[PDB]
Design a protein around this ligand. Structure first.
Ligand code: CL
Ligand code: CL
Ligand code: NA
Length: 473
């Protein structure tokens, strides 16, 4: 049963994000963020015209969140901090004590209940005052991000020892690649999304160096980043289809991980070269991909204590090019599809492909020299229901695959937090797609959290530290 047992030091828990759960969007001095703006001004972008104005009301109900974490037996709770709740103006001139108090209250409640906090600094909720300067495409945000992080380390770092600078910049950069999509819903594909990535990488590096310089000696924690990546399986066994899948990994994960996690640093060569060529062919004087200087390459490489991975699904990749000119997908040189045979979820993008998780973990091991990997998200959507057999099976299969990666393949996976502790505001999908292991009644002002079967099974896994016999192959 070795392949079915978690390593003794491995950390298990669950995850949320601030805008998705907190509500209290303008309470007690909190400033507006880009998701307040999107859901208020553009309800036509969101299923049901839903907003995060209340969500799970975790601003008021944080003790209930801790209660269900304790019931689950979580060792770690991954949550994010709302930048505009702490710094309502985005800049560090005004610190909102109500926000400081709130996160201290949550942290202290967690620790009093034997649960370790893991904090994501940025999970998509940029202060609107900073978006008004251009947001992530404007490199001035890297210093603003450093200053935000300093406030977080100063106030919380005596008790928080696990930090993620950013969550899914591959996703939030896409808020600069569509007029109707992710906040801030700006249509600069192939140009502004790359600028956003560039700023984020710079920001991440500044935050890491800040920790080294101002906090690490006293606080003794670890700083990483959470990167999402889909497995990309060759549509056929050809060398050409394999090349396309390598392109996919480099254009999705490598975009962020090559600058940070390799000895060489910088963007992947294929990313630089394909965008350079495409830009020239379209008549641009300058490549659409921003450049790092040698000094910047050296500053950015090595800025990590672990790699956070968000894993959900797989795609099929074949040789070719598609998408609009200009765009990151077109630049990436792969044609992406889904296999009809893969089980479905309530989310168009998410098919159940558990073996893809093991393949991805091996790809990461080989590319980045087996970094410590913390799975910061993994989970499954349905439309509702407590007898969530699909979710149960998603978890048991993904955990089995991860355990094979650890035990059979030697991948240094160090922790895992299920997405999500409870049903929450699923971005443009509103409350229509359910990812929780706890259900939440969004028509009940008290927002009760109630366990699904998946919460019961995960509790059993966390308690026994193994995959139960009935779920084994
Ligand atoms: Cl074949
Ligand atoms: Cl049994
Ligand atoms: Na402060």
């Amino acid at each position: 049963d070795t392949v079915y047992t978690f390593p003794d030091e491995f950390k298990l828990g669950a995850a949320t994000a601030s805008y998705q759960i907190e509500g209290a969007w303008d309470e007690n001095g909190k400033g507006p963020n880009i998701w307040d703006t999107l859901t208020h001004e553009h309800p036509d972008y969101v299923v049901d015209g839903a907003t995060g104005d209340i969500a799970d009301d975790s601003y008021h109900l944080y003790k209930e969140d801790v209660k269900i974490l304790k019931e689950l037996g979580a060792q770690v709770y991954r949550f994010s901090i709302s930048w505009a709740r702490v710094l309502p103006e985005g800049h560090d001139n005004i610190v909102n004590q109500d926000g400081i108090d709130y996160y201290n209250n949550l942290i202290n409640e967690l620790l009093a209940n034997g649960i370790e906090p893991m904090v994501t600094m940025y999970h998509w909720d940029l202060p609107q005052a900073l978006q008004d300067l251009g947001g992530w495409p404007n490199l001035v945000l890297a210093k603003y991000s450093e200053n935000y992080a300093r406030v977080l380390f100063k106030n919380f770092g005596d008790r928080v020892k696990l930090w993620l600078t950013f969550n899914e910049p591959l996703t939030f950069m896409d808020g600069y690649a569509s007029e109707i999509g992710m906040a801030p819903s700006i249509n600069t594909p192939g140009i502004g999304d790359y600028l956003a990535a560039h700023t984020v990488i710079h920001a991440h590096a500044r935050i890491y160096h800040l920790y080294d310089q101002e906090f690490r000696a006293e606080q003794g924690g670890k700083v990483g980043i959470s990167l999402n990546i889909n497995w990309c399986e060759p549509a056929t066994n050809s060398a050409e289809d394999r090349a396309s899948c390598e392109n996919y990994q480099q254009f999705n994960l490598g975009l962020y991980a090559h600058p940070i996690f390799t000895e060489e640093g910088d963007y992947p060569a294929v990313l630089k070269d394909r965008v350079s060529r495409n830009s020239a062919d379209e008549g641009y004087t300058d490549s659409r991909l921003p450049q790092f200087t040698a000094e910047e390459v050296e500053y950015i490489r090595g800025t990590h204590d672990f790699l956070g991975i968000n894993f959900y699904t797989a795609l099929l990749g074949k040789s070719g090019v598609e998408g609009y000119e200009p765009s990151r997908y077109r630049d990436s040189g792969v044609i992406l599809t889904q296999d009809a045979a893969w089980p479905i979820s309530a989310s168009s993008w998410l098919k159940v492909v558990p073996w893809g998780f093991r393949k991805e973990l091996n790809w990461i091991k080989n590319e980045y020299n087996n970094p410590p990997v913390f799975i910061t998200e993994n989970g499954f959507s349905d439309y509702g229901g407590l007898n969530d057999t699909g979710r149960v099976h998603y978890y048991t299969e993904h955990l089995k695959e991860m355990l094979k990666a650890i035990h059979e393949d030697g991948v240094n996976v160090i922790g895992y937090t299920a997405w999500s502790l409870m049903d929450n505001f699923e971005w443009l999908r509103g409350y229509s797609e359910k990812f929780g292991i706890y259900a939440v009644d969004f028509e009940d002002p008290a927002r009760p959290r109630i366990p699904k079967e998946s919460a019961k099974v995960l509790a059993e896994i966390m308690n026994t530290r193994k995959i139960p016999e009935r779920f084994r192959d």
